[PDB]
Amino acid sequence: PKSMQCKVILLDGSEYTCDVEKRSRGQVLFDKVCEHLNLLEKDYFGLTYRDAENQKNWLDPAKEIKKQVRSGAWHFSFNVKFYPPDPAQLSEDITRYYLCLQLRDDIVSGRLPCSFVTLALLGSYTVQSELGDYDPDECGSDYISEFRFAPNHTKELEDKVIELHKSHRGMTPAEAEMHFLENAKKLSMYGVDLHHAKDSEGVEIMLGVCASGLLIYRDRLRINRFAWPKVLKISYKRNNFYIKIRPGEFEQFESTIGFKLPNHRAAKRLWKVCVEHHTFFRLL
Numbered sequence: 001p002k003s004m005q006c007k008v009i010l011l012d013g014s015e016y017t018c019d020v021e022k023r024s025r026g027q028v029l030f031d032k033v034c035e036h037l038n039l040l041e042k043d044y045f046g047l048t049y050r051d052a053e054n055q056k057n058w059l060d061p062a063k064e065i066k067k068q069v070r071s072g073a074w075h076f077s078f079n080v081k082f083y084p085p086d087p088a089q090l091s092e093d094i095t096r097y098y099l100c101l102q103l104r105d106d107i108v109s110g111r112l113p114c115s116f117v118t119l120a121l122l123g124s125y126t127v128q129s130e131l132g133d134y135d136p137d138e139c140g141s142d143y144i145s146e147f148r149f150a151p152n153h154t155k156e157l158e159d160k161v162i163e164l165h166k167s168h169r170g171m172t173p174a175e176a177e178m179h180f181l182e183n184a185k186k187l188s189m190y191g192v193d194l195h196h197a198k199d200s201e202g203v204e205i206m207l208g209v210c211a212s213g214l215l216i217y218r219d220r221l222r223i224n225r226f227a228w229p230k231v232l233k234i235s236y237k238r239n240n241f242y243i244k245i246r247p248g249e250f251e252q253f254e255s256t257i258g259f260k261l262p263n264h265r266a267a268k269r270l271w272k273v274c275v276e277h278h279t280f281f282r283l284l
């Protein structure tokens with residue numbers, strides 16, 4: 001049976017290579033990658049691929065790989081798809097490890113904006129987990145030269161990671177990774193997938209998709225949120241995306257709110273990630 005080579009960029013930046021039958025569903029590849037990673041809490045994760053417009057798309061595990069990658073390479077990244085609001089409730093330390101790896105990339109890429117102090121805190125927990133107790137015999141030198149902590153490194157940031165690293169003596173790796181996540185989960189952009197859009201009056205906005213719902217940034221403020229509980233139906237038509245909201249108490253009619261996306265593929269991609277979040281993070 002005819003196999004296609006698959007390459008997967010792992011969260012540590014390394015490459016996993018395997019073959020799958022060309023008619024394979026995404027689940028087949030995802031299962032191989034998660035087995036490679038010893039990952040059992042798979043529900044939070046996914047593979048991404050890049051479409052012909054260079055846009056990030058989730059590989060639907062329930063659909064054929066060939067019908068998603070189409071004319072592109074069988075080239076994927078392993079990513080967190082659903083950021084858990086409380087990482088302490090994950091059952092396995094290794095799940096929390098992979099989530100830390102994703103957040104470290106979210107921070108360095110600048111997708112996850114972060115104060116100086118929180119960049120230093122997060123960096124100090126990572127160094128504690130991976131290097132263990134601070135070596136003071138080092139006293140002023142750069143044993144952290146290989147660690148990337150921020151979109152922009154400064155000497156002051158490096159100094160602050162080191163000062164905080166000294167304070168974590170005796171902390172074990174899972175402990176350090178749990179403290180990393182306790183800080184990161186509180187960041188206002190934690191787990192927020194951002195999409196360029198316009199409102200019904202043509203004003204530039206960003207739509208954020210996350211556990212808590214659909215966020216609208218009408219300025220550079222979170223000027224609004226639609227919690228998944230309020231949302232009855234998500235749809236797209238042409239370059240338009242719509243959310244149908246349940247009637248408020250005593251109100252006669254539902255409401256439908258409409259957004260303009262950059263093109264049709266961008267409207268469909270937003271609809272798909274909203275439906276997925278709405279299902280995964282729905283009130284039960």
Ligand SMILES: c1cc(CN2CCNCC2)no1
Nearest residue numbers: 048049050055056075076077
């Ligand atoms: C679009 C897609 C991605 C994530 N991966 C997909 C697999 N190839 C490498 C990039 N980033 O922008």
